[PDB]
Design a binder for these strands. Structure first.
Lengths: 72, 72
DNA sequence: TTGAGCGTT
DNA sequence: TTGAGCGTT
């Protein structure tokens, strides 16, 4: 389980931006942003341990609090 | 401003544990835990950028959500 | 605040 | 859910 769900994304948050933000924690291998805009994203890590360490956290991306959960 | 306040600490959270947890983000140079127990701590980073990136986040340490704020 | 497309045990 | 101690512009 190396994919996380990222809730409360804003529309200006691009895949590049999310990847740049999330790769601070470990290698990111994919980002999925729904189209049309649905205010969430999925971020996939190479390492399971990295994804699990983020679950349950609320992180600040460009001043916005996003919630991290397991991807199902 | 390279020091953060860590709110909602639990008593079992030792200085070593907090340092181990927080050094994932960057070099940690000090940890202060009040005695007697007051359910918060201060963590000092070598790098200001690291402290600022954490402010406003809620992080999970041993299953517990702690809130990160600027140290004043 | 839980996604696709290909193409079928 | 905002700390010490040393020792004084």
């Amino acid at each position: 389980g190396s994919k996380v769900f990222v809730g409360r994304c804003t529309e200006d948050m691009t895949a590049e931006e999310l990847q740049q933000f999330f790769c601070q924690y470990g290698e990111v291998v994919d980002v999925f942003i729904p189209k049309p805009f649905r205010a969430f994203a999925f971020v996939t890590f190479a390492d399971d341990k990295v994804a699990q360490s983020l679950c349950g956290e609320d992180l600040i991306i460009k001043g916005i609090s996003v919630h991290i959960s397991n991807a199902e």
